[PDB]
């Protein structure tokens, strides 16, 4: 365990809201916004509108023309924005030498499931319509957005859309039931009831085992190669271990990497965490690997 994770872990526990205090949604929304890291200042950005949602193209130096990432941000389907995620996506754009399409898809509870999925399938459609070739495309996302990547892949496939060259779920939430062992097993280690309220807000009485809400229950047959990142010290470890096994079973090329000592979407702490940067370099490597194949 490197010094930085030890310290980041301390700071997160020190800063945390006490266990079982219920923080209103607009208060989690404002705080996620206020604490967001600024994107590096060589990240360029262009505001676009895509399938009715605000988005930004997010281009680091060195982007190959014609390549793109549909990027789906985390936040439990209730919170998160282009702004909360510009930083880490800018760095994923740097690593993969591809510009990122950063979608501001519809959030619950104002827009429950399957709104988010519709926004992603439609953003991907939009990309193909602009003339990106599926083989020049990748879809990445974190937390809820990592589940969404998978939900978008399944929905797009069922709608006859072509699969992209690759997909990279980071710390995917792929199971709205939240019943996995790791919720108990990895509980102390994870510095990071609150997740249940999110599922409840997103689903709005939908079946929690609906394939497009909970892709760990979907038929993944025909999805492109997967890089799954997850941290050993997270409550969502199991979502990723089961995703990998479902993918493998379903004939999908999956590579799961459990990084030891790491927390939920530790990529996002790349400014002070060497593994955050390292895990991002590796997402860009795997994207680039898959585009060369």
Helices (H), the chain: 3-15, 25-35, 82-96, 115-129, 144-158, 182-185, 194-203, 237-250, 274-292
Task: Report d(CA 138, CA 92) in Å as an integer.
Answer: 11
- Beta partners for residue 71, in sequence order: 102, 140
Give the Å distances, CA to CA, from 170 to 54, 62, 151, 224, 279.
23, 23, 14, 16, 10
> Active site includes 264?
yes
> Active site includes 143?
yes
Task: Report d(CA 167, CA 271) in Å as an integer.
Answer: 24
Task: Report d(CA 16, CA 5) in Å as an integer.
Answer: 16
Selected catalytic residue, list 87, 138, 143, 171: 143
Task: Report d(CA 143, CA 171) in Å as an integer.
Answer: 5
Selected catalytic residue, list 234, 254, 267, 270: 234
Selected catalytic residue, list 73, 264, 267, 270: 264
Give the Å distances, CA to CA, from 85 to 188, 220, 225.
26, 27, 24
Q: Are 119 and 101 in contact (CB under 8 A)?
A: no
Tokens read off for 274: 């060497």
> Active site includes 140?
no
Can you tell me whether residue 276 is helix, strand or coil?
A: helix
Residues for the chain: how many in total?
293
- Residue in this structure with the two tokens 């009485």, named with its chain if needed: 205
| Burial zone of 242 (CB within 10 Å; 0-12 exposed, 13-18 middle, 19+ buried) | middle
Angle, CA of 151, 100 and 168, to the nearest 5°? 40
Q: Which residues are catalytic?
A: 143, 234, 264
């Amino acid at each position: 365990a490197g010094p930085e994770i030890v310290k980041l872990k301390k700071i997160l526990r020190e800063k945390a809201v006490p266990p079982g205090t219920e923080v209103p949604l607009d208060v989690m929304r404002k705080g996620m916004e206020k604490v967001a890291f600024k994107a590096a200042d060589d990240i360029q950005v262009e505001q676009v509108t895509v399938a009715g949602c605000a988005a930004e193209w997010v281009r680091a130096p060195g982007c190959q023309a014609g390549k793109a990432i549909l990027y789906l941000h985390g936040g439990g389907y209730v919170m998160g924005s282009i702004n909360t995620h510009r930083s880490m996506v800018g760095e994923i754009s740097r690593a993969s030498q591809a510009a990122a399409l950063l979608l501001d898809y519809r959030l619950a509870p104002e827009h429950p499931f399957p709104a988010a999925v519709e926004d992603g399938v439609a953003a991907y459609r939009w990309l193909l319509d602009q003339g990106f070739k599926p083989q020049h495309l990748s879809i990445s996302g974190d937390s809820a957005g990592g589940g969404l990547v998978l939900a978008v892949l399944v929905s797009a496939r069922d709608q006859g859309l072509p699969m992209p060259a690759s997909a990279i779920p980071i710390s995917p939430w792929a199971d709205m039931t939240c019943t996995n062992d790791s919720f108990k097993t990895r509980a102390e280690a994870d510095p990071m009831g609150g997740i249940n309220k999110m599922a409840a807000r997103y689903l709005n009485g939908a079946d929690a085992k609906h394939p497009y809400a909970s892709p760990n229950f979907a038929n993944l047959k025909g999805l492109p190669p997967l890089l799954i990142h997850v941290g050993r010290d997270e409550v969502l470890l199991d979502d990723s271990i089961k995703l990998d096994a479902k993918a493998k079973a379903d004939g999908v090329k999956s590579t799961l990497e459990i990084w030891d000592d790491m927390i939920h979407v530790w990529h996002a702490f790349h400014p002070m965490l060497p593994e955050g940067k390292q895990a991002i370099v590796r997402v860009g490597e795997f994207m680039r690997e898959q585009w060369a194949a």
